[PDB]
Amino acid sequence: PVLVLSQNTKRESGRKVQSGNINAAKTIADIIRTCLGPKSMMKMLLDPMGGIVMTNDGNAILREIQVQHPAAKSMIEISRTQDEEVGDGTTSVIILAGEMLSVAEHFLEQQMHPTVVISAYRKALDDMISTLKKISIPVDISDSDMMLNIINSSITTKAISRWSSLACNIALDAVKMVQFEENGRKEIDIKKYARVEKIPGGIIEDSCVLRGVMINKDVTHPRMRRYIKNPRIVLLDSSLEYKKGESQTDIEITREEDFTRILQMEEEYIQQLCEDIIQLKPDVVITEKGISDLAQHYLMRANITAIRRVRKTDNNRIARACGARIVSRPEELREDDVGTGAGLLEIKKIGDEYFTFITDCKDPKACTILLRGASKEILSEVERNLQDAMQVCRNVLLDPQLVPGGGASEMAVAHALTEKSKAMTGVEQWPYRAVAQALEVIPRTLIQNCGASTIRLLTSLRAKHTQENCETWGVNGETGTLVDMKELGIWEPLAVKLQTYKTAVETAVLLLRIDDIVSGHKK
Amino acid sequence: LKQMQVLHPAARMLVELSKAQDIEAGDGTTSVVIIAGSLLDSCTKLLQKGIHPTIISESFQKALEKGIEILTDMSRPVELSDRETLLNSATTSLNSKVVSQYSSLLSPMSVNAVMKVIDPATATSVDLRDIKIVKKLGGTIDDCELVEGLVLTQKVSNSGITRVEKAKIGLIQFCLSAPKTDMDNQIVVSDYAQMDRVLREERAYILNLVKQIKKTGCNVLLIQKSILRDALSDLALHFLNKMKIMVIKDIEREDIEFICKTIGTKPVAHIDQFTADMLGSAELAEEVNLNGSGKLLKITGCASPGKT
Amino acid sequence: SMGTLAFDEYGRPFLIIKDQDRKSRLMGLEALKSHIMAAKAVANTMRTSLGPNGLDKMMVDKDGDVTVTNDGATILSMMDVDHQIAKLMVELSKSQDDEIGDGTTGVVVLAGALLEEAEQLLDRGIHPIRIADGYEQAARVAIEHLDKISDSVLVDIKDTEPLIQTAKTTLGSKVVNSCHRQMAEIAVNAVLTVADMERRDVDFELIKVEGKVGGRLEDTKLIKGVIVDKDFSHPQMPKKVEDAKIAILTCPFEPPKPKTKHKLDVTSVEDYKALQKYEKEKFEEMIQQIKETGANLAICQWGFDDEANHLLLQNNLPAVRWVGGPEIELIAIATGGRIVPRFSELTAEKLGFAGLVQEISFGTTKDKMLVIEQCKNSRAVTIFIRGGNKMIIEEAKRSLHDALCVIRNLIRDNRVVYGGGAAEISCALAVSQEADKCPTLEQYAMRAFADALEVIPMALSENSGMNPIQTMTEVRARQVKEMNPALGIDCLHKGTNDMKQQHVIETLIGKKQQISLATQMVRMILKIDDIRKP
Amino acid sequence: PVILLKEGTDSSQGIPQLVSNISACQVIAEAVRTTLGPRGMDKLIV
Amino acid sequence: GPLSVFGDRSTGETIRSQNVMAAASIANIVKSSLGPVGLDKMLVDDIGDVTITNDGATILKLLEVEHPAAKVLCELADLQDKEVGDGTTSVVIIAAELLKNADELVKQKIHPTSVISGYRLACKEAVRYINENLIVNTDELGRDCLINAAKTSMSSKIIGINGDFFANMVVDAVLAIKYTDIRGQPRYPVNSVNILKAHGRSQMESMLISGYALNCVVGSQGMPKRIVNAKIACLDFSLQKTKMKLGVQVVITDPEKLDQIRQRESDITKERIQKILATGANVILTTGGIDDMCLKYFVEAGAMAVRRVLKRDLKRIAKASGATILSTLANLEGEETFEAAMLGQAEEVVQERICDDELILIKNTKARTSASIILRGANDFMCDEMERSLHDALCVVKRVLESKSVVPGGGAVEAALSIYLENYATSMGSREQLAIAEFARSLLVIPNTLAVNAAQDSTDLVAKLRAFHNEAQVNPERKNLKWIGLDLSNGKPRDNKQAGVFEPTIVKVKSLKFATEAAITILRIDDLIKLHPE
Numbered sequence A: 001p002v003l004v005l006s007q008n009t010k011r012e013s014g015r016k017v018q019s020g021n022i023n024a025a026k027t028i029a030d031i032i033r034t035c036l037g038p039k040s041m042m043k044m045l046l047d048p049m050g051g052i053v054m055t056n057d058g059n060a061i062l063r064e065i066q067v068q069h070p071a072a073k074s075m076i077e078i079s080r081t082q083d084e085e086v087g088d089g090t091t092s093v094i095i096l097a098g099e100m101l102s103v104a105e106h107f108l109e110q111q112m113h114p115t116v117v118i119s120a121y122r123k124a125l126d127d128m129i130s131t132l133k134k135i136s137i138p139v140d141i142s143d144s145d146m147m148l149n150i151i152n153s154s155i156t157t158k159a160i161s162r163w164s165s166l167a168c169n170i171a172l173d174a175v176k177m178v179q180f181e182e183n184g185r186k187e188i189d190i191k192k193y194a195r196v197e198k199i200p201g202g203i204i205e206d207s208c209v210l211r212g213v214m215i216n217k218d219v220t221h222p223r224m225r226r227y228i229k230n231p232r233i234v235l236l237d238s239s240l241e242y243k244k245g246e247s248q249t250d251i252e253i254t255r256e257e258d259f260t261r262i263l264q265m266e267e268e269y270i271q272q273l274c275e276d277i278i279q280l281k282p283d284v285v286i287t288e289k290g291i292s293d294l295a296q297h298y299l300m301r302a303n304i305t306a307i308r309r310v311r312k313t314d315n316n317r318i319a320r321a322c323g324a325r326i327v328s329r330p331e332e333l334r335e336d337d338v339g340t341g342a343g344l345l346e347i348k349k350i351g352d353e354y355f356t357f358i359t360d361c362k363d364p365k366a367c368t369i370l371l372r373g374a375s376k377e378i379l380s381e382v383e384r385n386l387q388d389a390m391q392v393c394r395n396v397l398l399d400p401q402l403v404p405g406g407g408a409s410e411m412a413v414a415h416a417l418t419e420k421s422k423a424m425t426g427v428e429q430w431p432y433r434a435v436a437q438a439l440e441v442i443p444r445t446l447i448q449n450c451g452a453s454t455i456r457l458l459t460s461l462r463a464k465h466t467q468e469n470c471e472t473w474g475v476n477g478e479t480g481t482l483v484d485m486k487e488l489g490i491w492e493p494l495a496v497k498l499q500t501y502k503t504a505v506e507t508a509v510l511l512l513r514i515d516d517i518v519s520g521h522k523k
Numbered sequence B: 001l002k003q004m005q006v007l008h009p010a011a012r013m014l015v016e017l018s019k020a021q022d023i024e025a026g027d028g029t030t031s032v033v034i035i036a037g038s039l040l041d042s043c044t045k046l047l048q049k050g051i052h053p054t055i056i057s058e059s060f061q062k063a064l065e066k067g068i069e070i071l072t073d074m075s076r077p078v079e080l081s082d083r084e085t086l087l088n089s090a091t092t093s094l095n096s097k098v099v100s101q102y103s104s105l106l107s108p109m110s111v112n113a114v115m116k117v118i119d120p121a122t123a124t125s126v127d128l129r130d131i132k133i134v135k136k137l138g139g140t141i142d143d144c145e146l147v148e149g150l151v152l153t154q155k156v157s158n159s160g161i162t163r164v165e166k167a168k169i170g171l172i173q174f175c176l177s178a179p180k181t182d183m184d185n186q187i188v189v190s191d192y193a194q195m196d197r198v199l200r201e202e203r204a205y206i207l208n209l210v211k212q213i214k215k216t217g218c219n220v221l222l223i224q225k226s227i228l229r230d231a232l233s234d235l236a237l238h239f240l241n242k243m244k245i246m247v248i249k250d251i252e253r254e255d256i257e258f259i260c261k262t263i264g265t266k267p268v269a270h271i272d273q274f275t276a277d278m279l280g281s282a283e284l285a286e287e288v289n290l291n292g293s294g295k296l297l298k299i300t301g302c303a304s305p306g307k308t
Numbered sequence C: 001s002m003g004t005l006a007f008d009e010y011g012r013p014f015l016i017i018k019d020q021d022r023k024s025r026l027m028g029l030e031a032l033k034s035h036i037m038a039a040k041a042v043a044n045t046m047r048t049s050l051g052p053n054g055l056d057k058m059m060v061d062k063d064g065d066v067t068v069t070n071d072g073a074t075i076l077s078m079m080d081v082d083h084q085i086a087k088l089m090v091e092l093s094k095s096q097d098d099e100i101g102d103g104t105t106g107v108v109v110l111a112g113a114l115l116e117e118a119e120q121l122l123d124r125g126i127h128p129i130r131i132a133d134g135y136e137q138a139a140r141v142a143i144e145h146l147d148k149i150s151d152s153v154l155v156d157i158k159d160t161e162p163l164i165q166t167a168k169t170t171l172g173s174k175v176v177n178s179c180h181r182q183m184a185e186i187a188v189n190a191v192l193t194v195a196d197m198e199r200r201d202v203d204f205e206l207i208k209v210e211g212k213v214g215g216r217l218e219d220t221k222l223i224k225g226v227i228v229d230k231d232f233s234h235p236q237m238p239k240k241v242e243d244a245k246i247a248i249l250t251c252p253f254e255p256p257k258p259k260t261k262h263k264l265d266v267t268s269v270e271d272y273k274a275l276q277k278y279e280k281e282k283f284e285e286m287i288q289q290i291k292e293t294g295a296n297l298a299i300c301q302w303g304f305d306d307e308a309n310h311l312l313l314q315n316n317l318p319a320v321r322w323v324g325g326p327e328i329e330l331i332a333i334a335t336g337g338r339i340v341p342r343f344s345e346l347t348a349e350k351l352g353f354a355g356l357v358q359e360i361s362f363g364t365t366k367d368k369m370l371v372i373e374q375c376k377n378s379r380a381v382t383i384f385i386r387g388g389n390k391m392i393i394e395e396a397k398r399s400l401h402d403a404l405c406v407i408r409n410l411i412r413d414n415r416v417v418y419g420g421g422a423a424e425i426s427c428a429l430a431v432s433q434e435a436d437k438c439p440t441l442e443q444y445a446m447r448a449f450a451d452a453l454e455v456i457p458m459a460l461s462e463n464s465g466m467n468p469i470q471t472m473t474e475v476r477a478r479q480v481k482e483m484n485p486a487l488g489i490d491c492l493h494k495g496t497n498d499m500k501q502q503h504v505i506e507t508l509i510g511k512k513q514q515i516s517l518a519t520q521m522v523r524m525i526l527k528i529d530d531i532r533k534p
Numbered sequence D: 001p002v003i004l005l006k007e008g009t010d011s012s013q014g015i016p017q018l019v020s021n022i023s024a025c026q027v028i029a030e031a032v033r034t035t036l037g038p039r040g041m042d043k044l045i046v
Numbered sequence E: 001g002p003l004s005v006f007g008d009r010s011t012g013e014t015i016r017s018q019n020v021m022a023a024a025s026i027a028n029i030v031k032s033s034l035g036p037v038g039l040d041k042m043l044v045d046d047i048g049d050v051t052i053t054n055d056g057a058t059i060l061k062l063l064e065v066e067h068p069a070a071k072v073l074c075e076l077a078d079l080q081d082k083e084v085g086d087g088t089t090s091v092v093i094i095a096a097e098l099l100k101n102a103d104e105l106v107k108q109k110i111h112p113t114s115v116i117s118g119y120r121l122a123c124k125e126a127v128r129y130i131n132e133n134l135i136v137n138t139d140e141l142g143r144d145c146l147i148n149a150a151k152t153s154m155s156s157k158i159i160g161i162n163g164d165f166f167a168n169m170v171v172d173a174v175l176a177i178k179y180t181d182i183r184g185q186p187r188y189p190v191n192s193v194n195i196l197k198a199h200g201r202s203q204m205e206s207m208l209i210s211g212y213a214l215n216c217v218v219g220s221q222g223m224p225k226r227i228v229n230a231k232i233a234c235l236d237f238s239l240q241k242t243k244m245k246l247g248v249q250v251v252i253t254d255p256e257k258l259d260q261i262r263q264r265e266s267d268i269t270k271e272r273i274q275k276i277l278a279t280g281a282n283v284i285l286t287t288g289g290i291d292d293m294c295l296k297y298f299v300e301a302g303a304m305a306v307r308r309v310l311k312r313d314l315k316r317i318a319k320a321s322g323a324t325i326l327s328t329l330a331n332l333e334g335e336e337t338f339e340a341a342m343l344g345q346a347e348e349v350v351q352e353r354i355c356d357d358e359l360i361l362i363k364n365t366k367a368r369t370s371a372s373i374i375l376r377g378a379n380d381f382m383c384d385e386m387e388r389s390l391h392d393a394l395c396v397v398k399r400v401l402e403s404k405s406v407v408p409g410g411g412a413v414e415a416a417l418s419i420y421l422e423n424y425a426t427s428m429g430s431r432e433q434l435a436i437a438e439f440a441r442s443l444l445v446i447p448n449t450l451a452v453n454a455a456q457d458s459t460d461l462v463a464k465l466r467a468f469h470n471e472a473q474v475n476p477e478r479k480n481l482k483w484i485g486l487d488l489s490n491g492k493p494r495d496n497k498q499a500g501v502f503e504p505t506i507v508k509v510k511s512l513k514f515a516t517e518a519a520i521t522i523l524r525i526d527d528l529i530k531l532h533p534e
């Protein structure tokens, strides 16, 4: 056999490849098309680990499904991108990208070149950005009511919508506490310092955000207190045990007293560490590494409560919450490194497990959202929805501009692009106007998932958006009627919708540039 | 013939024949095989006529002696001063190869190299190990070059010192690292002070070494390759760089005689014998880049460029 | 060696020929050299079976039967060849045997030699068609030189010594040279008895070559008449009949029977008795008709039954039954009788005459044969071959076939060239001279043709133990010096090199056919430059 | 879910298909080229 | 047969056609990715790993090629990418077309040596003609020349329409990393611009960092993440609890020493860190690790420590900020110190959150200007293709700034060379003449491919181009027509020097030289022996 490329190297090319990519993308779109809006339905995904994921989140769904077509791979990747960047719009992006590729299929069948289509798409994207920024409105982020409405307009499309007020307040409190500035750098890190702990049982209405943190831990010794009302807290990265040296420290004994002297020396070392700790007069000591029983003895003699092996992330949150500074050498321990600011340390039994609360903090720059509910799956969905809520709150606090929902923004932008296209005289006017009408898919899908007549409602809406001050008009995903968003209250973050449009248009551009698939070749 | 894994015994013998021709002359390895094959193909019909292989062999020996006589009579003497004759011989040898459009470039180089590595008045042969060939991808065959100095593929260890003018070069067959006896050696610590003392005395040992190196005027340092011991510790590299000395380690124990023959260096195996008379003076030592296709260390110019 | 090796400049399947991956192909000079290698192998196999001192080959068939022979055509027919050029060489030998009946080994050796010389010419770069054309030129020169140096022999029935010498030359190389002159004499007498001198035709169907294990090779003889592998129908009939008046019949001595579908209906005791009497009277009438014609012997082709057999015995009419059509025809031709299809048509003029009809035994065997001989002017004849084993009997049969074919070729054209390689040496000399006078590039091809013609004398010398080159050069030099194209190889070491004196004689048509066939097949082989096969 | 044609349908389309047709024709020609003319040769097929 | 090699053997036109077929396969893979209208390819690595690309070198690296004559062209694309950074597709296409036409000549029985001589002559004269007639000085053209060269390189990439902005970024970056060294020659060391990828915001949102961008983060969450008057310490050693080396053992025989020895194991590193921090270092980058014990010292000092930084990133930050990478805190006095002169400086060092990750930005370094680029797209596929395209653009701008000559694009150079060489072939021999004509004709595969990809009438367009260039070469008053090439958005020739379609001369020159070398190497093959593996 005289081949040039290895067998298993299969090469497709041309309009078959183009149509295949577009069909794979629009299939990814049809998978989650119904998961958009307030009247969506849940999907039960089965993990390879025997798990279950009951969700409405586009990125959760697409991340749990597996594909082999590279266009579908790219669509799943852009859903991941939207989730990582803004944490919302994970299904709006998929649907818009699918519709853009769908409308590009026309021009590709009609002998237009993909580069022409792409240049038109990029023109349209810039003009979309312009139109969104013109129709956006500002926000007074000090207005907790405005912020709660922003968060409700984002979680109404999720399961927690029944506990909307609770979840909104939880997310707002968590983000406002995680807001932190040091050396002129503002930081809302709701991934390291807003923690969600799901404890099955109880009821969701008792879920709360703590003014402090919570870990699943107990005292090292039951003689230690489990309730302290003004704890001075010390955090350590070092083991309070006697460990070996880094070198070959081998000893050689010939005298009798030397063995006992060595063991007593170990004990004295632990005593000296514990005294270096006691000198700061703490109430609680929390370690990422072990704590020997002799160290426990000395701390208890000092009336200190110890928690043995905490995670680095939990320790960092305890630091931010109680105002402490993690240390690694109790000899280097300072009052500035001691943690004052926690208002109560409690260690209580939730079910048959012991949980440590460091709550009642003042100015805690970290938090723990304690979720309670029927099951790990329900609580996983509540946690994902709360991630959405907190990420939306964060996007707003960073860029306080808002845009109207219910497809109002899509219709306003489509109208503006159609109006700008009348000055266009080249051949790109057609793909340009096509992406403009391809933005209409969001209200179309909303109407479909509400169960109303897309033709009639979308026609009335496209007509409403030809009037002057009607860029706020959209549709209810709950009744199937056109309303003013100024009256309904569904306002999305400009950052979210910008990222959505950009990701959609660029995904379309990528899949349009793609041709001539090749496969088989092994790295 | 060596690359096609011939299996018949006679064909193997022809392979060995071509190798022997490559040894004795290095040119004619195809003509010799063709001549052998043809003589045997004629022996075929001779055998058929009914002549004995011994008679064929003796008559072939006769024809060989007469043919050597004939070729010598045809021949004309040559003076090694006849550079045009040498150029024409080289061009003829190259006409058969893919590099024949480049003969105008590679024949004068093939004549210069040999005329640079032999005493033309006394030489009766040539050792082509005096001619080093360095294959580097990139460029074209029109970029082949004849370097009178030294070329190395080993990389320079210093950052910032790539070029050296008026270069004094030293070969180091000893290791610039913490002392290590050839016997089992340990350093037993029993007090905390001995630890600080150990680190400090190691620093001082290395610094004394690099200072004895600097004191000679050496600015280029070729370190032999050393398994069983670190030939160039990071401390030594730090000190050499601070002292502005280019360092090329991992030199191979087979390139040593070549490097010495080239740049007049003398290999030093004990720091006590590392002096100025054991160095080599080169007008330049540079790490040259080849259009992003790699790097080469070129030691060009030499006060003792010895037949290499 | 592959039909198609691309699979496409775009990665898509390239299927042009069916099973192209399992198929092979050889093109060009390598195909030519493969052909030459195969032909040289065949020719070097055959050259040791050439001449008086040539040795035989022992062929074993699919079912394990053994055949010892020196005949090149029989060897190459029994040979299980797979190579197509070797198949062409088998066809070449078969063609020489068909046209001539001798030379079947010379043709193969000569063709192999021509291809072996073409090998060097192709190495020097000559076009194979130019080689073939030079071979045609040299072959024409050699054929005319044979016509030039040929001699003529008398093909009369008075002095048969030249024909006996020709047949002895033919049989010198065969195992039957122990009875050299006896075999030659009987081949000559056979063809001259059965040969149309005016027509110049010899029908070999009139020569029955029969072999029977037993006896000695010296017992082989020519019967001027017929021999049959049958006996008299009744064991009490006499085993000898002298001055036999023979009735040859193709009617079974049985009650008549229509060929058409017939049903004879018996409807009464009178009908049954009439049928009975009809059968009786039919048998009696058959025997009475044969007797009234005057015959002393009957020979039927279709066997008969108990009543007819006993009536023949009672009426003193020895009879043979179940005689085959061909031997019935030969018996008619030999005895001068006419074949009769029914008894009513039998007359004293349609009878044949044989002065002796005898049943012959073969020792402790139970096998009997019938000899019919002493006819007046038998235009048919039989060669009865005896010997100690079926292998030497079959070899004797084919050797005598060679001798008969040679006498046939003399009757067709009496011109004779002298053998022992002398004709080949003379033709090589003539071709060399004309190549010297030829100024075109075919000079080389003609020199090659001469060097190939010189392979037959070399092969004879080698098989005779002489040094090929030495012997051939001395006899060539003698031929050019003293003009005598009858100077050749003393294979039998009679001292003289003169083949005209040793009476080593070939047929001019034989040598000419050798040269022509070898050249034509070498041409068709050099014209091939591409082989395809699964 | 359901394919238009029967599984195993091989469709070659476009400029590559045309160039491949031309190349196959070149092969067929090569198979007979050397038989042309007074200096032409014969082919042996089995 | 006769040759007993244990392998397959191709010989003659068979292997020549095979070599050309392989080269054609490789070129047909990439032809569709040539020019502003070329399109990208997916490549799946047998596991679902996806790669989008238009870069021919990338494509041929990712492919698994089996034929050696095709491996040659893959290596050709790799070599073009190493020595130039652009032209990796054009060089392969041209090499394959030269191979095609040269094999056509060899089929017509022009000797391959003659084809090779003619190709070498045509390559030399094409290089000379370019250097003499088709170059424009970037000094005569200004900075818009660099912008146009970058935009020309970016056409055919996924940063095409955004070229208006990406070209500004590339030019600013290359001018930022411009540095002059000893010999006073200006050097533009690309690969010192850092390129980071972060899916997220649109392409237009990609950032040019005046300074440096590090794919690293601080070592401890208690450390600050912004520092303004950054004093930077670049260390090539690890900051960990000190362990005695291999040839040093602690053997205690007095228990009273164990405590002090164990404490020294940490106090050594503590002392080194205190020495570093005493000079004012608030930012400490390390190629090695930093134990938690040490990170706590940095935290308490209010410093920013970074561990496991890459050696090349550290070298660049040091060169850019004015720092000295230290492998050890050791001076020529046998002590351990850290001088404030070994520090570097920067107007800011921050940990910035890009998408869902974080990196470090070192902004406004003194003692040199540096440049980093954070590419922002929709997913990793886009980001990788943008990285490759940006590397191409950076290499192109580097070549334009090093050699101040550019040539027009759109097949202008190839059309001019086709005309000039088909006129020049008339002077050199008769068969080398045909070889030079075929070289000229081969050069036209570039505008042909551009038009084919643009879906335009390649025949008409290239004929118009050649007509323009012939008018330019025969009428001295219209020499400005040299600058005419294809406008692939309209299917009409155009003055590409005024349109801004520029290529560095080195691109075309090296393309021609390398393609010629590859064609000669492949054409020199007349046999192939493929040994059966063991």
Ligand SMILES: Nc1ncnc2c1ncn2[C@@H]1O[C@H](COP(=O)(O)OP(=O)(O)O)[C@@H](O)[C@H]1O
Binding pocket: A035, A036, A037, A038, A040, A058, A088, A089, A090, A091, A092, A093, A153, A154, A156, A157, A404, A405, A406, A407, A442, A446, A475, A476, A477, A478, A490, A492
């Ligand atoms: N009450 C509502 N009526 C109509 N549309 C709504 C309502 N609430 C949200 N939407 C719209 O639904 C979309 C969000 O749906 P969702 O399922 O959260 O998808 P994603 O967040 O992945 O885009 C936005 O267009 C938003 O404006």
Ligand SMILES: Nc1ncnc2c1ncn2[C@@H]1O[C@H](COP(=O)(O)OP(=O)(O)O)[C@@H](O)[C@H]1O
Binding pocket: C049, C050, C051, C052, C054, C072, C102, C103, C104, C105, C106, C169, C170, C171, C172, C173, C174, C419, C420, C421, C456, C460, C489, C490, C491, C492, C504, C506
């Ligand atoms: N007595 C003889 N002396 C010399 N040569 C002979 C003699 N008998 C036969 N030959 C030669 O041997 C050759 C081969 O003859 P033979 O083997 O009988 O049949 P074929 O010609 O088929 O091989 C003839 O060319 C003839 O010249």
Ligand SMILES: Nc1ncnc2c1ncn2[C@@H]1O[C@H](COP(=O)(O)OP(=O)(O)O)[C@@H](O)[C@H]1O
Binding pocket: E033, E034, E035, E036, E038, E056, E086, E087, E088, E089, E090, E091, E152, E153, E155, E156, E157, E408, E409, E410, E411, E446, E450, E486, E487, E488, E501, E503
């Ligand atoms: N704007 C343009 N108009 C016409 N031709 C162009 C333009 N930009 C680039 N080209 C041509 O595209 C060809 C190849 O470009 P590309 O495939 O991107 O890079 P390369 O082939 O050099 O790897 C070059 O011949 C170039 O002249």
Ligand SMILES: [Mg+2]
Binding pocket: A088, A089, A154, A157, A388
């Ligand atoms: Mg949402």
Ligand SMILES: [Mg+2]
Binding pocket: B027, B028, B092, B093, B094, B096
């Ligand atoms: Mg030679």
Ligand SMILES: [Mg+2]
Binding pocket: C102, C103, C169, C170, C173, C402
């Ligand atoms: Mg005979």
Ligand SMILES: [Mg+2]
Binding pocket: E086, E087, E153, E156, E392
């Ligand atoms: Mg390019």
